[PDB]
Nucleic acid binder design. Structure first.
Ligand SMILES: Nc1ncnc2c1ncn2[C@@H]1O[C@H](COP(=O)(O)OP(=O)(O)O)[C@@H](O)[C@H]1O
Ligand SMILES: [Mg+2]
Lengths: 319, 257, 255, 253
DNA sequence: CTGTATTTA
DNA sequence: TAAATACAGACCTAAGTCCTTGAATGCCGC
DNA sequence: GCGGCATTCAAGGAC
């Protein structure tokens, strides 16, 4: 081997706002903003792999044309979160003179904006206030709560949601058409099912399946990509008899190499997000799983503790 | 288009060094007469004015009065690269987005072309009206710089007292105080270190020590300082050039009761 | 038993100060022909290869090949314990352990005995690079260091371009841009000022600024540095010593 | 009243710089035959005792013992006003509130005036016991400071050995070891760089590196420094220029 | 939540 | 003088590391 | 003798 080829995430990364299959309303708003100009300050939030960084990148490209090189300051906020960075480099770029078309502005992209420190986040407010007529800020984060309220006060807020199955399927079919890949409907359904609304993860799984087996079929997908781990745990707690829950814990989880701490964390998360049972039952189950987790975190993590967890949950469900 | 050629780049290097620690962003206005630059301090307490005439350049060119918004830190970084024996050429094209600094060696053919991005400085053009003062003297820059450096170690406030043709510099701090008394004298064989003073009214002002240090940091463009006092007006601290000057307008303290 | 006796004690200090920031741990290979050393940066971006022959040593005795694994952050302090007019002596027993450094004055009578505990670096360092490059230039070390430190302020990436009798350093950053252009000239009145260039094919590639600043820290050894570039090959920055040389194989950035 | 016309401001500048980072606020006792200064660090390991006689001054006048409390940092900041061509004049009155320092130049048109406000500090009694010391060495101050700064890099504990008329400074750290060995030296051509040694019993002791680094700060006072070692008494570190002298009493562990 | 400051009825 | 709503009561310490960040220390360069 | 930069460390915050 001498070299590798570009991954389908990067090779088929959209370069225009039309190629994005995300939320139609916000994408159309971004297209209209790019067509008209006067882009306002914004923060885009959502879950990983739904088209947040790509959307802002294509928006900046379409807005600035050939002036992207000298009009876009793209920094990973987690990479550069120091208050000194905002004080010196961001400030100098904001005051920098640049002759631009009468509807376009310099764009500051702050990727992973949720990781910025408090000092830089507070220092950015006056920087974005005094140079708001020639410098525009677009934050890309996963949690809006990590950004201070005054920072959110001066900008538009774009909450991206999980991609629907139809959009992911359409993008996947477009990729297969552009790559000439042998596929099966069951394989694409499995890819979507294990994607859980993350387009990047779906694309990566599809590319890995093609490179490893060649045929996108459900059997191959489940062989190379395991089924979502929380679903087995959810089936495990919701068992009617203790024997079945013990069997799932033994075979699907313990004999497959899943660590005890992972199992207890997944059970905690599933019971937190569970909706089939009542509130009191859920809180009592979380109590028992938390006690077992406390036992595991001391290094007592074995199969006996998880067996006791399931037995005590089944006692709780036994009225 | 503008193409201004200096005699030594070190001259502009010292000019930029003189007023780089007080202001940060300066509008350089270029006209057929020369270059004028006025900048207000971030605290709006010390104003910096600078004039460089057409006779301070080896070659001068201007087709229209042009404004250049420059950051002094970046300018110092660019000018630090040059040496003492290079010709410095400032070049600006139409629709100025950046300024080119050419350093040309006279003994070799090596050329160093640097680029500096301009800044948008939304500052108003004000007029520095000249009015007759009450006291105007000239004393060597080095001595004044030494007095400021010794007196700043006690307090941040400096009282200037010109009375009875005596100059009194007072620094009243937390630990003791310091007083410097100067009597003007005319020394024949070198007038360079003489003190030429004209006093009409005895003036009592008070200034900030930090601004005084920022002003004396420019004690490399001349031998003496033209120091002009006024009781209701900011004082003028001037360093004369071959064809221009560097003035500092320093607003005094509040002379309460 | 390794026993080395230098001409001047500051020459080893000047050698080690070149490696002070770009290298942490080194494996000195001691043989009958001299001391060899090869090291890789923590980021594995530059490679340092030092060779000092028996000429630099006033005395030399190496019974068998020796491997001395040592840390530079301590040897720098140990050499800083000497003087400008001292002489240095390296002592190592049959089994490599606790290298001994002896500082002796020639004007007076003084003995400075220092010890350094060795460390076992498992990775071996014996690779040698012998390949023709597209361009070979030579310029004074002070001038090259001046350009590197002057253009490092503009950005973190410095592009070197070799074209027909033209040498270009470009540095484009956020505060502006800069370009230094030189021509190869021959100075008969002083030979250590002239700049030589032999090119086979034009080159254009970019390095990081901080690694260049670390390499130019070796300018205190030789007054002239050679710079060898090739396409898809590491760049060779060579300071020639009296008995050997020191070479940095520094790797460019991906385009 | 107190009127002390110094020979040069640089002399007092260096004498004050000798113990910058040792103590902060101390009281100088000024009496007719000279000025004494006693200070103790909070670690209770070093005693700084500075005696300056009348002969060290170009003019000295005082008729009543006085105590003058002051902070070292502000005093040094005041001395920064001095240059190489001005002389110091210290004026104190019967009511200690502020010392008046006058800088006098050869040209009578440049006269400087400054004031130093006194602070009140609880003084400590004098440690002037002359207990017998086993060994006595005398070595150049610059060389000694060089050895101290060299051995402080390896370990924080410097071992001093006076043994078989050999002087050994040992610094065994985690990265390695250090050993500087010197022999007695008498010179007839430069009577300032010599290694004088008078040994009665061999002396083995260990001292802190930071303490010795603080002591060697007074190397600007003298070209050579005299060290007296005892196994049961604090070691003495002595600098002197012509008549004014300074001692550090280090209590070994 | 109670309790208080502010605005408008 | 009542509706009508905002909206304020209050801020913890040991501990573990990692991170930032101001400021002092430290050294080299000039 | 300052001037400048780099390094280190302590104070607060977060989980
Ligand atoms: N709505 C979408 N339409 C098309 N491709 C998408 C979409 N969302 C994500 N992708 C793919 O995911 C890759 C990177 O996604 P990215 O936008 O960085 O995720 P995030 O939104 O978490 O930043 C891109 O190469 C892109 O092809
Ligand atoms: Mg992203």
């Amino acid at each position: 081997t001498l070299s590798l080829q570009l991954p389908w995430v990067e090779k088929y990364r959209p370069q225009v706002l039309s190629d994005i299959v995300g939320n139609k309303e916000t994408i159309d708003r971004l297209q209209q903003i790019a067509k008209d100009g006067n882009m306002p300050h914004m923060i885009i939030s959502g879950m990983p792999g739904i088209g947040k960084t790509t959307s802002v990148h294509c928006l900046a490209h379409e807005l600035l044309g050939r002036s992207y090189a000298d009009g876009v300051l793209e920094l990973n906020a987690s990479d550069d979160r120091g208050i000194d960075v905002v004080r010196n480099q961001i400030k100098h770029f904001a005051q920098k003179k640049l002759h631009l078309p009468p509807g376009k502005h310099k764009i500051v992209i702050l990727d992973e904006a949720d990781s910025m420190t408090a000092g830089a986040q507070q220092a950015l407010r006056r920087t974005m206030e005094l140079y708001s007529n020639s410098t525009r800020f677009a934050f890309a984060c996963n949690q809006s709560n990590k950004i201070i309220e005054p920072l959110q006060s001066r900008c538009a807020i774009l909450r991206y949601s999980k991609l629907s199955d139809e959009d992911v399927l359409k993008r996947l079919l477009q990729i297969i058409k552009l790559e000439d890949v042998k596929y099966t409907n069951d394989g694409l359904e499995a890819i979507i099912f294990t994607a859980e609304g993350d387009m990047r993860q779906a694309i990566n799984n599809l590319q890995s399946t093609v490179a490893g087996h060649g045929l996108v079929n459900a059997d191959n997908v489940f062989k190379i990509v395991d089924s979502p781990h929380p679903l087995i745990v959810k089936k495990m707690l919701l068992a009617s008899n203790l024997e079945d829950s013990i069997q799932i814990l033994r075979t699907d989880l313990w004999k497959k190499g899943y660590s005890s701490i992972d199992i207890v964390t997944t059970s905690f998360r599933v019971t937190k997000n569970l909706a089939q049972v009542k509130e009191s039952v859920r809180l009592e189950m979380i109590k028992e799983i938390g006690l077992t987790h406390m036992r595991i975190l001391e290094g007592v993590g074995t199969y006996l503790q998880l067996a006791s967890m399931l037995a005590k949950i089944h006692k709780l469900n036994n009225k | 288009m503008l193409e201004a050629k200096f005699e030594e780049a070190s001259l502009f290097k010292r000019i930029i060094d003189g007023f780089k620690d007080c202001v940060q962003l300066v509008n350089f206005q270029c006209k057929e007469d020369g270059i004028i630059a006025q900048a207000v301090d971030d605290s709006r307490v010390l104003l910096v004015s600078l004039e460089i005439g057409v006779e301070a350049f080896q070659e001068y060119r201007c087709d229209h009065p042009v404004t250049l918004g420059m950051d002094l830190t970046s300018l110092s970084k660019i000018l630090r690269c040059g040496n003492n024996t290079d010709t410095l050429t400032l070049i600006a094209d139409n629709t100025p987005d950046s300024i080119i600094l050419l350093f040309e060696d006279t003994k070799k053919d090596r050329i160093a072309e640097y680029s500096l991005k301009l800044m948008d400085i939304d500052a108003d053009f004000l007029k520095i009206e000249e009015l007759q003062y009450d006291s105007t003297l000239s004393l060597p820059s080095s001595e004044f710089s030494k007095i400021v450096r010794d007196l700043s170690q006690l307090s941040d406030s400096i009282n200037i007292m010109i009375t009875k043709e005596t100059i009194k510099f007072v620094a009243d701090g937390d630990i003791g105080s310091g007083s410097v008394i100067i009597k003007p004298f005319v020394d024949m064989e070198h007038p360079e270190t003489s003190i030429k003073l004209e006093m009409d009214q005895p003036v009592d002002l008070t200034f900030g020590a930090k601004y005084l240090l920022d002003i004396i940091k420019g004690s490399s463009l001349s031998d003496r300082v033209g120091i002009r006092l006024s009781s209701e007006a900011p004082a003028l601290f001037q360093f004369d050039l071959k064809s221009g000057f560097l003035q500092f307008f320093l607003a005094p303290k509040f002379n309460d009761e």
